[PDB]
Structures are given as C-alpha cells and as structure tokens.
Design a protein around this ligand. Structure first.
Ligand code: 2N7
Ligand code: 2N5
Ligand code: BOG
Ligand code: BOG
Length: 500
C-alpha cells in the first residue's frame, strides 16, 4: 500500500503550536550577491555556461542568468523544474581500473541557478526557523559536549527515566507530497519579503513536490539543498513524533531530533506500561507515514540507547569527577582508517573520527597514535587535509587538533581515565577481531610519538602535551588552550586555529 497518511487531532494541535512559533520568525530575503557567496567552491556546474567560481566571485553571465531564474520563479507558479541525477563514485570500495561498473551513490539536484535562488528565498528561514520552532529539541545546534550535557541533564530531570530511539527508514526518497506542503505552510508563517513568499510557493510546487529528472523519468524524492532537506526532515519528524508522544500518552517527554533520527526521554510508568506506550507510539508514527526501521525498545540505562550510530558512556577526569561522552562501536572507524593507511582519500574519515570522538578510548589510543606516527614519518603534520564531517568538507591541519577538541569536547577530553569495562571490552574485542595490536602496544607507541612531537616545538609540541598526556606516567598539568578573542588580538598573530 506504500505511503498512506492518516492525520488526527494530536497532529493538528502540534502543527498549530509550530505555526504559532513560526510566526515569531522574521526572515530576510538574500540578494544575488549574498546568495552567490554561500555557493560551495565545488558546487556542480550550470547547464547554462557557468559553474561555481563564476557565481562564487560574481560574473555578468552567472548573475544575469540567476536573476532571470528568479524572475521566472516569481512569474511561473506551476511549470516543473528539471533536476539532474548523477552517480558520485564510492570512496571505500574497490574501483575498476581499465573497465567495469563503478560502485556509486546517486545524487539528485536542480540547476546551479535554481540552487542560488533557493538560498535567496530560504537560507535565512532554514538557518533560524528550526531552533525557533523546536527549541532544545533541535539536534543540530549542539556540539558533542553540549549534546551529552543536554541528554544527561534530561535523564537526571526524571524521577524514573525511560528512553528510546526511533529511526524512520529511507524517508528522504519516500517524502509524501503532504509533508512537503505542510513544511511550506510552516515556512509561510514567517515575516517574509513578498518575493520570498512567492519564490517559496513556486519552488515547492515546481521542484520540491516532484518533477522530471535527467542525465530519464519523474521524481518524488528530495531535490532541495542540504540545509533545506535537513530543516524539512527535522520539522516533519518533530511534528509526527510530538503528536505520537501525545497519542501514546508519554509523560514529561524530552525529545532530541536530527533529521529522521530521534530520541525521547520520559517518565517510566512501569515495564509493561512502557512496552504498551511504545507500541502506541509506533502505531501513531506509522499512521503519520513514518514507520520504524527496527521497532523501538524502552531503555532504563541512558548508555543502552543508540542513536546516530552513537551512545553515551562514562569516564573520569583527573579529579575523579564523572565525565559523560558520546562513543560508538569502533569497527567501521578502524576499517575506514585501515583503508586510508593504504590509500589517500578525499574524506579523511580518520580525522573526522578523531574530531567527533576525541574523548573515546579508541580515538585517543589508536587513531591519534597511528596517524601522528604516519604524519611524523611523512613530514606532513603542517599539511591541511580535506575532511568530511557530516554535511560539509573542511580543510583541517592536524596541528590544530588540541584547539578543535577543546572547543567541541572541553578540556576534560585530554584527561579522561577509568573508562567503563563494557566500553573497554567492546574496543579490546574489536582489536582482537581485526588483528590490531592490543591497547598496551598503543601506549608504548604513543610514548615514542609524544617524544618526537615534543622535540619539534610549537603546535607539534602542544599535540604531544595535550593529545598524548594519557600515555605518560608523570602527567603534565594541562591548562585551557586560549582562543584569540581571549588573548584580545587578531588571528594573524596567533598560530593555527585562532577564532575564524
Ligand atoms: C578490515 O579492518 C581493519 C581494521 C584495522 C586494521 C586492519 C583492517 C588491517 C588488517 C590490519 C593490518 O595488518 N594492517 C597492516 C598494517 C596496518 C594495517 C593496514 N595496513 C595497510 C597493513 C590490522 N590493523 C588495522 C589497523 C588500523 C590502521 C588504521 C588505524 C586503526 C588501526 C592496524 C594498525 C597497526 C597494526 C600493526 O602495527 N600490526 S603489527 O604490529 O602486527 N605489524 C607491525 C604490522 C595493524 C593494524
Ligand atoms: C537524536 N540523536 C542525536 O542527536 C544524537 C545522539 C544520541 C545518542 C544517544 C542518545 F541516547 C541520544 C542521542 O548521538 C549523536 C551523535 C552525533 N555525532 S557526534 C558523535 O559527532 O556528536 C550527532 O551529531 C549529528 C547527527 C548532528 C547526533 C547525535
Ligand atoms: C587494508 C584494508 C583496506 C583496503 C586497502 C586497499 C584499497 C583498495 O583500493 C583499490 O586499489 C586498487 C589498486 O591500486 C585500485 O585499482 C582501485 O581503484 C582501488 O579502489
Ligand atoms: C551512562 C550515562 C548515564 C547517565 C547517568 C546520569 C545520572 C547520574 O546520577 C548520579 O550517579 C552517581 C553514581 O555514582 C550518584 O553518586 C549520584 O548521586 C547521581 O546523581
């Protein structure tokens, strides 16, 4: 029966509350220049004789064509807009050389001109509306450290906490026409410029609801930009879930939403009562056309909930105080890093894993040790690497890792010890399974890596001091690494990542 959507009073009530909050948002219509500057340098070429760089640093051909696309969006409210379907080759896969089928992910996008028009009309709404509507439930406002703080405080707030994760399997292609229209109705509640209001209506009717796809066919999958798709999915999932919490009569809910991924922390009503409540929640979500991947399970320990491939775990700082942090099973991070040891990638998953999971036993002992050893050998500590973290691609120098880690995780990230036996066992058994040397070997290797870094001075010695303080018996004190704004001077006089 594919997608069949049934909307009730709970859904309608939550939508009114969302629209009432949306009404307090005043969003601005970006000029051609403002939108052009937001174009990524490696954004796909237009079929109209220009393509990134030209748009990015303003060009007569690019700007005048994008102004005609804009005029057409304001004047035509129904003609379907075309989208291109392309195969982007896979990174962690054996790629045929001198003939063969190339493993690839498929990407669907409108012409570059349309993409800049979408930014003019929606960038300010997508970057302001979700937080204004969902508040603390909006998952993309948090750093790993702030996210864990939010979760733990929500868990501690309950008399008898219960929590569960709910994941909607492949929604990005299966997005209903209704969901797209409901999203638009929320965006329309903002204080928009009249041209924005029309452009939003045209884009939703001509592009977002569906349209033709070419190098052909017709698509009903998301053709919006990353920021637009993210906003849409999060608002839709929040709407359906907040309504489903009411239908399931869940008490004192705290939700955390990241696109299609969600977590609810509420008050337990007893084992069998909670099991019934979750069945109720799932029935409501399924009726709202958001069925689960795996049926949700009530959890009574925060550590047992897995969401966005991660779970909360405990460690202790140097003073013995409990420190909470996000971790994950290290099999895929290690397997991808093994690949990268043999072959250079444009993603540098190892570096992204060190940044996302810096407090973890496996990122500190294995990934930092192994890659600093390689960088020392190759004399490439200074070389900025392109690193993909979630959406974006960042250029990161390994020498700036202490500063980055402190910003995202806090100073405790460098002093953690007394990790949970279960967490250690997951790491240890994983090393045995993959043929990786045990943790005792990594300590020996890190003492040598730290020594070589210290001898190099500057940022290299700060990497030695902060990142490998776990490897020495006689530990250094470790004070916060000061930001350029704290020092009260320009980033030009501050080595590495300063505050830009
Ligand atoms: C499929 O999933 C995985 C996952 C992990 C590993 C492998 C495969 C690779 C099988 C192993 C291997 O033997 N390798 C050698 C060395 C590194 C890795 C990849 N490389 C292309 C060839 C076993 N093996 C893996 C890693 C990873 C390297 C990146 C950072 C994280 C650890 C190792 C790191 C050091 C040794 C280590 O030092 N082993 S040792 O002491 O027995 N010896 C000196 C080689 C062995 C490793
Ligand atoms: C809705 N779920 C969440 O927001 C997340 C949870 C979580 C895990 C267990 C729970 F019990 C509750 C939440 O863990 C995460 C880890 C990351 N990445 S990271 C490791 O880089 O921080 C994340 O960042 C991206 C997607 C923005 C979002 C979440
Ligand atoms: C160590 C475990 C991870 C695998 C590392 C090997 C990476 C495979 O990489 C492959 O190498 C071939 C030979 O140059 C190329 O022909 C392929 O295009 C490439 O995908
Ligand atoms: C795995 C992450 C679980 C998060 C638990 C947050 C609640 C912490 O709770 C604390 O636990 C301590 C345990 O020794 C007790 O001493 C404290 O009294 C209690 O408030």
């Amino acid at each position: 029966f594919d997608r069949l959507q049934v909307l009730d009073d709970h859904y309608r009530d939550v939508l009114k509350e969302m629209k009432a909050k949306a009404s307090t948002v005043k969003a601005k219509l970006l000029s051609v220049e403002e939108a052009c500057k937001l174009t990524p340098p490696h954004s796909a070429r237009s079929k109209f004789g220009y393509g990134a760089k030209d748009v990015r640093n303003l060009s007569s051909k690019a700007v005048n064509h994008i102004r005609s696309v804009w005029k057409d969006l304001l004047e035509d409210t129904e003609t379907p807009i075309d989208t291109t379907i392309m195969a982007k080759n896979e990174v962690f896969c054996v790629q045929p050389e001198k003939g063969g089928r190339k493993p690839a992910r498929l990407i669907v996008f409108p012409d570059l001109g349309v993409r800049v028009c979408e930014k003019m009309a929606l960038y300010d709404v997508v970057s302001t509306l979700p937080q204004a509507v969902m508040g603390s439930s909006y998952g993309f406002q948090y750093s790993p450290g702030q996210r864990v703080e939010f979760l733990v405080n929500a868990w501690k707030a309950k008399k008898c906490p219960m929590g569960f994760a709910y994941d909607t399997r492949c929604f990005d292609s299966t997005v209903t026409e209704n969901d797209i229209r409901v999203e638009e109705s929320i965006y329309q509640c903002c204080d928009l410029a009249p041209e924005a209001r029309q452009a939003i209506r045209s884009l939703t009717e001509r592009l977002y609801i569906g349209g033709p796809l070419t190098n052909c066919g017709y698509r009903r999958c998301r053709a919006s930009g990353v920021l637009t798709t993210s906003c849409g999915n999060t608002l839709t999932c929040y709407l359906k879930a907040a309504a489903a919490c009411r239908a399931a009569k869940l008490q004192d809910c705290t939700m955390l939403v990241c696109g299609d991924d969600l977590v609810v922390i509420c008050e337990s009503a007893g084992t069998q009562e909670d099991e019934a409540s979750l069945r109720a929640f799932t029935e409501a979500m399924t009726r709202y056309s958001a069925p689960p991947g795996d049926p949700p399970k009530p959890e009574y320990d925060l550590e047992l909930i897995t969401s966005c491939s991660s779970n909360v775990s405990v460690a202790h700082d140097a003073s013995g105080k409990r420190v909470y942090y996000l971790t994950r099973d290290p099999t895929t991070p290690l397997a991808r890093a093994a690949w990268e040891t043999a072959r250079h990638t444009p993603v540098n998953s190892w570096l992204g894993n060190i940044i996302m999971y810096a407090p973890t036993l496996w990122a500190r002992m294995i990934l930092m040790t192994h890659f600093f050893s390689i960088l020392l050998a190759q004399e490439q500590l200074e070389k900025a690497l392109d690193c993909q973290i979630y959406g974006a691609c960042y250029s990161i120098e390994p020498l700036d890792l202490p500063q980055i880690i402190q910003r995202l995780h806090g100073l405790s990230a460098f002093s953690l010890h007394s990790y949970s036996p279960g967490e250690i066992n997951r790491v240890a058994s994983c090393l045995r399974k993959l043929g990786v040397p045990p943790l005792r070997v990594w300590r020996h290797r890190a003492r040598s890596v730290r020594a070589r870094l210290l001898s190099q001075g500057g940022r290299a010695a700060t990497c030695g001091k902060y990142l490998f303080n776990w490897a020495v018996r006689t530990k250094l004190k470790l004070t916060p690494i000061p930001a350029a704004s704290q020092l009260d001077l320009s980033s030009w006089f501050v080595a590495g990542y300063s505050g830009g």
